[PDB]
Amino acid sequence: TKGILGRKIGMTQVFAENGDLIPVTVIEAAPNVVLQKKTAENDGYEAIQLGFDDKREKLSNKPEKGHVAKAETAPKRFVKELRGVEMDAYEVGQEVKVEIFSAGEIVDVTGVSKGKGFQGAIKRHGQSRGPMSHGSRYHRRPGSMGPVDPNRVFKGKLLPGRMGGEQITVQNLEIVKVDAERNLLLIKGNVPGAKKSLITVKSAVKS
Amino acid sequence: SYRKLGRTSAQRKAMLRDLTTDLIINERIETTETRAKELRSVVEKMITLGKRGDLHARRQAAAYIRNEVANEENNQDALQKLFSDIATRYEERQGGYTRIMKLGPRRGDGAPMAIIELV
Amino acid sequence: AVPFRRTSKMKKRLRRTHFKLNVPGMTECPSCGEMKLSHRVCKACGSYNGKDIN
Amino acid sequence: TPMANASTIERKWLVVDAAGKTLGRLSSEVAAILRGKHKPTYTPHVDTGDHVIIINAEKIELTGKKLTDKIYYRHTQHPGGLKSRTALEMRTNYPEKMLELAIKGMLPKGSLGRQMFKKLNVYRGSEHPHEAQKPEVYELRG
Amino acid sequence: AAAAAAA
RNA sequence: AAUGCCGGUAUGAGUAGCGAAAGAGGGGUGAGAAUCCCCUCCACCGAAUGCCUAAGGUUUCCUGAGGAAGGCUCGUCCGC
RNA sequence: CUCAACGAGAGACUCGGUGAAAUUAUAGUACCUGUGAAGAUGCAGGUUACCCGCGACAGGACGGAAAGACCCCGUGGAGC
RNA sequence: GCACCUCGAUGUCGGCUCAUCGCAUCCUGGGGCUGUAGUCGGUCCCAAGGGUUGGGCUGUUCGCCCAUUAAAGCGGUACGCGAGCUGGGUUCAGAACGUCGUGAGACAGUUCGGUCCCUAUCCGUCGCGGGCGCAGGAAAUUUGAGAGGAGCUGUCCUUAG
RNA sequence: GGAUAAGUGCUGAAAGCAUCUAAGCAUGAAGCCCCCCUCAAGAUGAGAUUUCCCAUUCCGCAAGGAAGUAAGAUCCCUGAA
Incomplete structure (x- = not known):
């Protein structure tokens, strides 16, 4: 498999080869430098480390500076592993760019979703709402916790809490256009997360 | 997003106009820190309105400056003070006409106080 | 909404573990001291980096 | 008045092979070994039992x-x-x-x-990583 | 009857 | 060991509440000021939240000091 | 409501000041299946579980508040 | 049916919200026998993974009807759930109709109207922190013992009239 | 994909035949265990890889205990994706 990880900028619309109008998500995801190659005889599994969005030396630690010394590159903000890529096909310090994806391919997009704060059960779990009239004092409440006989609430009872901030994967999106000059990926559909957050684009599980 | 400061929007506008004008006459006031943070952008916007010096900017500033006397035994209003002293004082400076310096907490309610001054 | 049993002394003291409050961010004032909490004007001398501004 | 050992217990290492025995009949003997029922210095509150290693668990x-x-x-x-x-x-x-x-x-x-x-x-x-402890081969009583 | 009408 | 009587002290707990409805700044007093005094804006009632006059209360009215307790916080202030 | 989504204010949240009440055998107070005055946090067998908090919900503690009002008894009473 | 537990209180119907469990399976999946020519069927097996509706009438569950659907399944959980919600009916105090009673009054006969309290201590659940451990102190990246989520299907065209 | 339920079987004797079974092999369901997604070493069985910091001072003859610090982090401040 193949993949690359970067920052998304925002959404736009692009018409392509017909009159049809396509919702397009823009992702800056290049260049990515291979930092570490995981091997089965040493680490127990096969993976590669990709680094993205290098930063100033003031914001990087001495272990972070020493970890990227082997790849001959600046310390980078985002490090994630890809598993399992076609071993080996990449050497340590080789730049991964957006040219690996053609503009007709099917990819998997994952990322940390937008935070919503501590929210009620109606918004967090999609639970239906109580009546506002005919004497009713009941609305926006989670419901009965369960029966009487267990003398307890069963685990998994849906209750208000914090929504968002979790990893969400959207499957089988399509690349609309690839921009090798400006390091941009144009992806059909919606992408989870807020603006300028980390987005990982990996090849889909075919077929 | 702007702060609400525990007030109604009309009360917010009235209190911000009062604090802006009172800073414009007395040149140094002592409020809470969040009131200072909400006040400084409005005050530098009104100083920017005073920078232009034309009649339309003065009529824009007249909708915000309250009618209190600025300079005694001169009959100078605050609206005249913006276009006579503050604009000529801050002609070279591009923004940052106010600074906020924090003080200790208040005795009665633990409110963190701040010094606001025109610089 | 009614307590079934009273709280014992040990459970009350265990709940009051985090009720304590911390030492403020107090530092040496370069003018006189002592001492001055960080990012505020000193109440003794009225100075802040480093002019007497009161 | 009778002896009761505490922090003087010497623990040995035993290897038990499970190629032909049941799940089963060996497990009670291994539990009795781990409790310390084979030693005359058994004291029920200080764990006088000794270590045991079982190999060939797939051959059970x-x-x-x-x-x-x-x-x-x-x-x-x-x-x-x-x-x-x-x-x-x-x-x-x-x-x-x-x-x-x-x-x-x-x-x-x-x-x-x-x-x-x-x-x-x-x-x-059929190998264990405890060769540094020098374990001895234990034969089951039956 | 068992009417819950406690006052 | 009476859902006993009286007195003292806990738990809940630093929790609920602090009782409709606009305050802001600059000076003053003072050991201590978000709450007291003065000034300037802003706001509210205005067939009243204005004026007086019964019933009723009875000193609560004024001046000078004071702040213990009572102001559901503070208090240099008060119908204390 | 289908079918709910935003916005404003008060409480709830944080900090400063002040600060109760119902209740309370002691309590280091998990779950399942049984057993038992026949419906178990405390019993038996097993399965799980580092210590201490904060914000929420209310299934249980046959929760609290009222010596059940229904039914029955009293060789009780009262009204008609 | 009995009266074992509760009368120094275990709130009782029907709906709303939230569900969970067992198949004696309504559909979907795989089969046997058919008096199964094919479609549609009948009966009996294996299978709970998922889904099993919008109304008119009545307080109603139930039931009848309208229009769909792949089907509109039976039950348990204090006939699940009122310190989560409503009181329309039962089930107070008022007033009538019919009947019984001389009468005061009575009627699982009817109708009109009729106060539903609680600031969560503990266990449970949903989220978020602070410690300590993991035989040195750290910054990152991670394998996965285990756990949770998802799991449904219609119609049309070819093969092929 | 793997082992399967009901079924369908192959080769076969107890019982010279016959036989889905008592040994050996299959095929077979929206059931199961994975492949799809997510949390996951407090998994006290606390795992693994990479890269920094180094091995001071004073007491305690041993165990150990105090002060300063390196790598690094925090108090305090500007803010929100």
């Missing part, structure tokens, strides 16, 4: 039709959380926790039981 066998009839249950704290597998699937993939569940069932329940469970070491055959 059990009589009757228990390969398809014996069912292991690992129920969660969630409703409908009853998960089940047969003895054949538990032996084929990883019979180590089969043997440790047998020993944990025959060990006493408590802090000493969890302590004596720590001396047990079950491995897929």
Whole structure:
């Protein structure tokens, strides 16, 4: 498999080869430098480390500076592993760019979703709402916790809490256009997360 | 997003106009820190309105400056003070006409106080 | 909404573990001291980096 | 008046081979070894038992039709959380926790039981990484 | 009857 | 050991509440000021939230000091 | 409501000041299946579980508040 | 049916909200026998993974009807759930109709109207922190013992009239 | 994909035949265990890889205890994706 990880900028619309109008998500995801190659005889599994969005030396630690010394590159903000890529096909310090994806391919997009704060059960779990009239004092409440006989609430009872901030994967999106000059990926559909957050684009599980 | 400061929007506008004008006459006031943070952008916007010096900017500033006397035994209003002293004082400076310096907490309610001054 | 049993002394003291409050961010004032909490004007001398501004 | 050892217990290391025995008859002997029932200095509150290593856990066998009839249950704290597998699937993939569940069932329940469970070491055959302890080969009484 | 009308 | 009587002290717990409805700043007093005094804006009632006059209360009215307790916080202030 | 989504204010949240009440055998107070005065946090067998908090919900503690009002008894009473 | 537990209180119907469990399975999946020519069927097996509706009438569950659907399944959980919600009916104090009673009054006969309290201590659940451990102190990246989520299907065209 | 339920079987004797079974092999369901997604070493069984910091001072003859610090982090401040 193949993949690359970067920052998304925002959404736009692009018409392509017909009159049809396509919702397009823009992702800056290049260049990515291979930092570490995981091997089965040493680490127990096969993976590669990709680094993205290098930063100033003031914001990087001495272990972070020493970890990227082997790849001959600046310390980078985002490090994630890809598993399992076609071993080996990449050497340590080789730049991964957006040219690996053609503009007709099917990819998997994952990322940390937008935070919503501590929210009620109606918004967090999609639970239906109580009546506002005919004497009713009941609305926006989670419901009965369960029966009487267990003398307890069963685990998994849906209750208000914090929504968002979790990893969400959207499957089988399509690349609309690839921009090798400006390091941009144009992806059909919606992408989870807020603006300028980390987005990982990996090849889909075919077929 | 702007702060609400525990007030109604009309009360917010009235209190911000009062604090802006009172800073414009007395040149140094002592409020809470969040009131200072909400006040400084409005005050530098009104100083920017005073920078232009034309009649339309003065009529824009007249909708915000309250009618209190600025300079005694001169009959100078605050609206005249913006276009006579503050604009000529801050002609070279591009923004940052106010600074906020924090003080200790208040005795009665633990409110963190701040010094606001025109610089 | 009614307590079934009273709280014992040990459970009350265990709940009051985090009720304590911390030492403020107090530092040496370069003018006189002592001492001055960080990012505020000193109440003794009225100075802040480093002019007497009161 | 009688002797009661504490912090003077000498613990040996034993190797038990499970090629031809049952799940089963060896597990009670291993639990009795781990409790310290073979030593005359047994004291019930200080864990006089010694370490044991079991090799060839995949070579274990059990009589009757228990390969398809014996069912292991690992129920969660969630409703409908009853998960089940047969003895054949538990032996084929990883019979180590089969043997440790047998020993944990025959060990006493408590802090000493969890302590004596720590001396047990079950491995897929036929090598163990405890050659530095120099373990001796133990033959089963029957 | 068992009417819950406690005052 | 009476859902006993009286007195003292806990738990809940630093929890609920602090009782409709606009305050802001600059000076003053003072050991101590978000709450007291003065000034300037802003706001509210205005067939009243204005004026007086019964019933009723009875000193609560004024001046000078004071702040213990009472102001559901503070208090240099008050119908204390 | 289908079918709910935003916005404003008060409480709830944090900090400063002040600060109760119902209740309370002691309590280091898990779950399943049984047992038991026949419906278990405390019993038995097993399965799980590092210590201490904060914000929420209310299934249980046959929760609290009222010596059940229904039914029955009293060789009780009262009204008609 | 009995009266074992509760009368120094275990709130009782029907709906709303939230569900969970067992198949004696309504559909979907795989089969046997058919008096199964094919479609549609009948009966009996294996199978709880998922889904099993919008109304008119009545307080109603139930039931009848309208229009769909792949089907509109039976039950348990204090006939699940009122310290989560409503009181329309039962089930107070008022007033009538019919009947019984001389009468005061009575009627699982009817109708009109009729106060539903609680600031969560503990266990449970949903989220978020602070410690300590993991035989040196750290910054990152991670394998996975285990656990949770998802799991449904219609119609049309070819093969092929 | 793997082992399967009901079924369909192959080769076959107890019982010279016959036979789905008592040994050995299959095929077979929206059931099961994975492949799809997510949390996951407090998994006290606390795992693994990479890269920094170094091995001071004073007491305690041993165990150990205090002060400063390196790598690094925090108090305090500007803010929100």
